[PDB]
Write a protein that binds this ligand. Sequence first.
Ligand code: NA
Ligand code: NA
Ligand code: NA
Ligand code: NA
Lengths: 205, 205
Amino acid sequence: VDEANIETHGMVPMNRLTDDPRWLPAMSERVTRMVQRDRNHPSVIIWSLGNESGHGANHDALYRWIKSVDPSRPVQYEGGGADTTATDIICPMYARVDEDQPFPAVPKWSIKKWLSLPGETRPLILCQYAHAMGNSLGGFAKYWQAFRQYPRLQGGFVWDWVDQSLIKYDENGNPWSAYGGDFGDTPNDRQFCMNGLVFADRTPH
Amino acid sequence: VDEANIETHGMVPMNRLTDDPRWLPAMSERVTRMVQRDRNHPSVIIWSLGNESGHGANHDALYRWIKSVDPSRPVQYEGGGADTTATDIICPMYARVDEDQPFPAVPKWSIKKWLSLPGETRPLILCQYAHAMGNSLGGFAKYWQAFRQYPRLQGGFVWDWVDQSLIKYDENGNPWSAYGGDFGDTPNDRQFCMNGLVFADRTPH
Ligand code: NA
Ligand code: NA
Ligand code: NA
Ligand code: NA
């Protein structure tokens, strides 16, 4: 999945820049210039309009731009409820197998319920599931049971591969794995950079 | 649900008479004369082409006959896998909530999985579920949790209301409830006539 370098997660709402036409130029260069560079690679099967930036009208514009200039690949985008007009795939992040999380505007339905909502035609492939932060991947079996039972459940992408720990050296030059704040960075989100199936040195969890 | 007087369950295959054009006349008069008599009752919201008679080309013919003559009401029929071209409603009997029963030709999918199958848009209302024979209705709550969670699961009809017990009198003329074989009837299917939520005298189970 080749993803454009667009994330506006910290805007309030997440929509603020991606729905503004004054940001459509900046956003189009990050989508279009990706397609122009990577369009010949067979490994790329799906284009992504970015991550966690709500759902703005610029998303719908650039979705249709990709469709027009490269019909050979589906386009996906999770923002604004995972099933917007700018996605060919229902690509939720952390939608649970049986339990609904009915957040206002942007609900995370049961992946099994989500398929059968009236008028919903598309496959579902979680762009992110099974958050692997420390001692986790509890209930991972429950996804794959559901994946195998339901044809339109075609799997997902685990979040994620590598702990984003950095090496620091103490006063005597011993290396140790550091996370949020360990460099005087404030504010910070501490451990939440470490979500990997493997440690930073690629040792398996 | 107003249901035509057509069941050919014991034919091998169930399809045998309902696919035969020579039985289209006999079947048409059981469907058409039902509609002519009961088409003014507001209590009647759904027409049924019959019960357990497989899926024949006569079913499709009489389905279209009802659609043409009375658009007011959906038509449903369970025979030949509960999702045939002769039904507006996915009307399985004894489809389970979570577990598939993948019988060749006529599978009973999990009612939740059934809804999500590619191209399937219809509501699902079990024509028969929760077989209440003797000490039964185990797992009844599992259905209703699913009915409430899934919009396109719109419920079902329990099998069934009354024990088909009959009364016999002992040597003193005290009555007792009889079933299959209690009248010298052979062959017979014994207790299988008693499937009700109530006894024959309408005392609840
Ligand atoms: Na599957
Ligand atoms: Na993280
Ligand atoms: Na419902
Ligand atoms: Na029975």
